[PDB]
């Protein structure tokens, strides 16, 4: 029969740390070690929470660590062992078809452009991303990208980029452990208001310990924005890899289930009836398996 | 004033287009502060008056050299992903002209009360009896929201397009692209 398992929990791959922010000056980012972090402040307008840079700063210092785990096709809790074996065979067949080539390149793009800087990148005239490869506590290999050249819409190539792509692909395959400290540097302006992820004093801004922060799941949703294989209209760029391709800004869901392009129909075509989809659709399927989920029937 | 440039906000899965309009308006305000001049117009081509919606495009009316200096200004960095634009082409000839105005409001009675402390030195109860709480103005016009480097408070800038006349009038433009007496073509 080979039905879908009743429980199909998948862990998140590419675990993001809780991204802080901090303030400082451009051309002092080489000495960006003891930079003072911005703080959530209550201001009476009714009182609301605001976060902004001080007077003697124009650059943000969003820092988070990303861990590439591997074993993307392996579920954490699968009800059926035959379905788990068939799905592992299908994911391994995908790996022999391509060894996490395009997915790691697009994830290296979402690292390379500061899409994790959601609203801290729109008003910035100079955005910079620094990625250190921490291995046994030391910087194995450093990278210093530029989000101005690497656009948020097109999907290009660059040599250090491909180096980051092979590193993320080796992490996703399982041939090693990849831990990347990513520090952003956006010239948002002198004392301009920044946008941390907001907690729910009508509205509060989330922090960790005397220092404002961005949520991990915001960084994860920014990293998942590789999906361009949806039936795109009206000139929309990449969307986040979600089940049934939904975006909150447009209020609509691409990859509609009335079409045969949502993630679950592509899974049941790929691993149950052996109807292998296109290369782009299986790229999207493996990206959704990388992000994790609670997949399964009821 | 003869040339126009249409900047259309490319849709974003992260932001509704109102914040893109606000960011573009602040960036063009900074560009107009840095450049100087008052022959630079601002319009809204798909301005629907049904729900006071701004639309999804923006129109800039200026000369050839002024628009060339505007594109040569580095204000456009960081906005190429969210916006797309053509070239500073000329406007069509049979185009009726309308004006654009910034209509502010006295939405805070307490601000005017604090003003009247600084002009007549009256008391708080004299301010409350002279100015009640019903003096707040509700304005049903399209608007963008902005913050300033000089004044850190977040302010709303209402934009209103005037009646469609038949000719243009010689007038200047503000740093926001709004008219202090100027006119822009409509097409």
Swiss-Prot record, chain B:
Quote the catalytic residue positions.
29 (proton acceptor)
The annotation note on the cofactor reads: Metal-ion independent.
GO biological process, any? defense response to virus
Q: What does the UniProt record report as the effect of altering residue 49 to K in this chain?
A: Restores biofilm formation upon phage infection, crRNA forms
What broad class of enzyme is this? hydrolase
Ligase: is it a keyword of this entry? no
Q: Which residues form the signal peptide?
A: none
Q: Which GO terms describe its molecular function?
A: endonuclease activity; RNA binding
- The site feature described as Substrate binding is recorded at 148
The reported effect of residue 148 to C is: No pre-crRNA cleavage, still binds crRNA
The effect of disrupting this gene, in the record's words, is: Infection with phage DMS3 inhibits biofilm formation; disrupting this gene restores biofilm formation despite DMS3 infection. Normal biofilm formation in the absence of phage infection. Loss of production of crRNA in the presence or absence of phage. Disruption of the entire Y.pestis-subtype CRISPR region disrupts crRNA production but does not alter phage resistance (possibly OLNs PA14_33350 to PA14_33310, plus the flanking CRISPR loci), indicating this CRISPR is not involved in phage resistance.
Matching entries from CDD domains are given as:
Cas6_I-F
Impact of altering residue 29 to K?
Cleaves pre-crRNA 130-fold slower
Q: Which domain of life is it from?
A: Bacteria
The reported effect of residue 102 to A is: Loss of pre-crRNA cleavage, still binds crRNA
EC number(s) from the headed UniProt entry:
3.1.-.-
Q: Which UniProt keywords apply?
A: Antiviral defense, Endonuclease, Hydrolase, Nuclease, RNA-binding
The record's family statement is: Belongs to the CRISPR-associated endoribonuclease Cas6 family. Cas6f/Csy4, subtype I-F/Ypest subfamily.
Please explain the role this protein plays, according to its UniProt record: CRISPR (clustered regularly interspaced short palindromic repeat) is an adaptive immune system that provides protection against mobile genetic elements (viruses, transposable elements and conjugative plasmids). CRISPR clusters contain sequences complementary to antecedent mobile elements and target invading nucleic acids. CRISPR clusters are transcribed and processed into CRISPR RNA (crRNA). Processes pre-crRNA into individual crRNA units. Absolutely required for crRNA production or stability.
User: Any remaining note in the record?
Assistant: In this bacteria, Y.pestis-subtype CRISPRs do not confer resistance to phage DMS3 or MP22, but instead are required for DMS3-dependent inhibition of biofilm formation and possibly motility.
Q: How does it assemble?
A: Part of the Csy ribonucleoprotein complex with a probable stoichiometry of Csy1(1),Csy2(1),Csy3(6),Cas6/Csy4(1)-crRNA(1). A Csy3(6),Cas6/Csy4(1)-crRNA(1) subcomplex is also formed.
Name it: CRISPR-associated endonuclease Cas6/Csy4
Which organism is the protein's source? Pseudomonas aeruginosa (strain UCBPP-PA14)
Lineage, highest ranks first: Bacteria, Pseudomonadati, Pseudomonadota, Gammaproteobacteria, Pseudomonadales
């Amino acid at each position: 029969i080979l039905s879908t398992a009743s429980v199909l929990a998948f862990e998140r791959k590419l675990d993001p740390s809780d991204a802080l922010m901090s303030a400082g000056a451009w051309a002092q980012r080489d000495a960006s070690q003891e930079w003072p972090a911005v703080t959530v402040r209550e201001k009476s307008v009714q009182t609301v929470d605001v976060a902004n840079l001080p007077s003697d700063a124009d650059t943000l210092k969003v820092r988070f660590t990303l861990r590439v785990l591997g074993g993307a096709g392996t579920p954490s809790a699968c009800n059926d062992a035959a379905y788990r074996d068939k799905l592992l065979q299908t994911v391994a067949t995908y790996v022999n078809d391509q060894g996490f080539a395009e997915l790691a390149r697009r994830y290296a793009h979402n690292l390379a452009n500061a899409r994790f800087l959601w609203r801290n990148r729109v008003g910035a005239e100079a955005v910079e991303v620094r990625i250190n490869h921490i291995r046994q506590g030391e910087v194995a290999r450093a990278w210093r990208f530029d989000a101005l050249a690497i656009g948020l819409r097109d999907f290009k190539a660059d040599a250090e980029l491909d180096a980051l792509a092979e590193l993320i692909a080796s992490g996703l395959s399982g041939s090693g452990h990849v831990l990347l400290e990513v520090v952003a540097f956006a010239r948002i302006g002198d004392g301009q208001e920044v946008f941390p992820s907001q907690e729910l004093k009508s509205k509060t801004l989330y922090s960790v310990r005397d220092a404002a922060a961005i949520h991990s799941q915001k960084i994860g949703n920014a990293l998942r924005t590789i999906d361009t294989w949806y039936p795109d209209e009206d000139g929309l760029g990449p969307i986040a890899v979600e089940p049934y391709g939904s975006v909150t800004s447009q209020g609509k869901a691409y990859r509609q289930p009335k079409q045969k392009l949502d993630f679950y129909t592509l899974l049941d075509n790929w691993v149950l009836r052996d109807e292998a989809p296109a290369v782009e659709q299986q790229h999207y399927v493996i990206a959704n398996l990388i992000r994790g989920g609670v997949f399964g029937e009821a | 004033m003869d040339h126009y440039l249409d900047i259309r906000l490319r849709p974003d899965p992260e932001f509704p287009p109102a914040q893109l309009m606000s960011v573009l308006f602040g960036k063009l305000h900074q560009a107009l502060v840095a450049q100087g001049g008052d022959r630079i117009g601002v319009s809204f081509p798909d301005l629907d008056e049904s729900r006071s919606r701004l639309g999804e495009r923006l129109r800039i009316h200026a000369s050839a050299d002024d628009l060339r200096a505007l594109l040569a200004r580095p204000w456009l960095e960081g906005l190429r992903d969210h916006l797309q634009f053509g070239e500073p082409a000329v406007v069509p000839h049979p185009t009726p002209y309308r004006q654009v105005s910034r209509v502010q409001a006295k939405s805070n009675p307490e601000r005017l009360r604090r003003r009247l402390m600084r002009r007549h030195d009256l008391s708080e109860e004299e301010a409350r009896k002279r100015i009640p709480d019903t003096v707040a103005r509700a304005l049903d016009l399209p608007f963008v929201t902005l913050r300033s480097q000089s004044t850190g408070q977040h302010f709303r800038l209402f934009i209103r397009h005037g009646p469609l006349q038949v000719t243009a009038e010689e007038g200047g433009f503000t740093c926001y692209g709004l008219s202090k007496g100027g006119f822009v073509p409509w097409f």
